[PDB]
């Protein structure tokens, strides 16, 4: 099952880099042993361990960028919403709710009334 993610996420950047290289040399050691076994299922465990560490390294590095760009007007396009191309071209709620002062006066002056019949 390999290493466990929540331990990796409590580590710093420099610790993760040390464990990454420590796992990579161990994977290289196994591929040398594969020349003689040749069946060696532990290779599978190490390869997925390298994946987990690389994932934690990336996800930690990405949230540091998110904090750097919180509330800014312009942020990197990979940090923007990725809904669909058409939904990004669509008018925002503020833009779609924009209303001329003439139209605002009419809607306020004549709202849809509530009424009933036969009384």
């Amino acid at each position: 099952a390999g290493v466990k993610t929540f331990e990796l996420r409590t580590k710093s950047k420099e610790q993760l880099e040390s464990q990454l290289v420590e796992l990579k040399q161990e994977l290289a050691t196994l591929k040398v042993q594969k020349l003689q076994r040749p069946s060696l299922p532990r290779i599978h465990t190490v390869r997925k361990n390298i994946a987990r560490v690389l994932t934690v390294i990336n996800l930690n590095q990405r949230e540091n960028v998110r904090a750097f760009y919180a509330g800014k007007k312009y942020i990197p396009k990979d940090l923007r919403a990725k809904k669909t191309r058409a939904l990004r071209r669509k008018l925002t709620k503020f833009e779609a709710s924009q209303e001329t002062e003439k139209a605002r006066k009419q809607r306020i002056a004549f709202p849809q009334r509530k009424f009933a019949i036969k009384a």
């Binding site: 919403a81 669909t84 939904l87």
Partner: protein, 86 residues
């Protein structure tokens, strides 16, 4: 001598592999693919060739990104992460 004797002189390919569709239909001298129309921006496709659309169209490949558009649409194109249940 237009049969067997002439068939022995076939060693100069008219077509090579196309970069866009990988089909061996790229005309070397014309620099055009007779299959997909490369290097034109549009793909070559005709309404008089309906079986040819079947061979190369959406769904005949991986659909690696369109696979999940329905899944993302069904959840309203969420942002963020899932929460752990209390």
């Amino acid at each position: 001598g237009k049969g067997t004797p002439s068939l022995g002189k076939r060693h100069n390919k008219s077509h090579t592999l196309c970069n866009r569709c990988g089909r061996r239909s790229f005309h070397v001298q014309k620099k055009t693919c007779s299959s997909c129309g490369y290097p034109a921006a549009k793909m070559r496709s005709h309404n008089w060739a309906l079986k040819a659309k079947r061979r190369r169209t959406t769904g005949t490949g991986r659909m690696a990104y369109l696979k999940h558009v329905t899944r993302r649409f069904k959840n309203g194109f969420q942002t963020g992460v899932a929460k752990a249940q209390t």
